């Protein structure tokens, strides 16, 4: 159940309300200010890292289940999403429908959106690819 959620459900959830549009109307106050802006933020693919922990000093290193249990830490990985920021503007002539046009500003980076706890012995856990000898090295019970 967890593998299905992480593999497919996470992407689907973000692909429902990915687009956020803010519309700034003409705000007719003078003939020198008649342009209407439209700023759009869209969420693309989502990436998941291996389990990791960030310390107080800001150093991040791979976290294994044994250390998490002893250090009272949460066994979780990081979530990243590609964000595209687009802005549209057009000349808002009074009493007419607008035709928004791309204004040559389409930024397109990875944004951290929180940490997802990882179930042990899952596709995203370190113990899924570990053999019996590897588990003994990691102080994990086969």
């Amino acid at each position: 159940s967890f593998n299905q959620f992480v593999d497919y459900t996470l992407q689907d959830i973000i692909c429902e309300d990915s687009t956020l549009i803010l519309e700034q109307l003409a705000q007719h106050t003078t003939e020198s200010d008649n342009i209407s802006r439209k700023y759009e933020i869209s969420f693309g693919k989502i990436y998941v890292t291996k389990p990791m922990v960030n310390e107080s000093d800001g150093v991040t290193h791979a976290l294994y289940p044994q250390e998490a249990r002893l250090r009272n830490l949460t066994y979780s990985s990081g979530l990243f999403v590609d964000v595209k920021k687009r802005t549209y503007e057009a000349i808002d002539v009074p009493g007419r429908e607008l035709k928004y046009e791309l204004i040559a500003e389409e930024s397109e980076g990875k944004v951290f959106i929180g940490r997802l706890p990882i179930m042990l012995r899952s596709k995203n856990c370190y113990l899924s690819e570990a053999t019996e000898s590897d588990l003994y090295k990691l102080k994990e019970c086969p």
Binding site: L22, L25, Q27
Partner: peptide, 9 residues
Amino acid sequence: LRRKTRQLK
């Protein structure tokens, strides 16, 4: 006037 800020779905 308007609120000069609105969201389109």
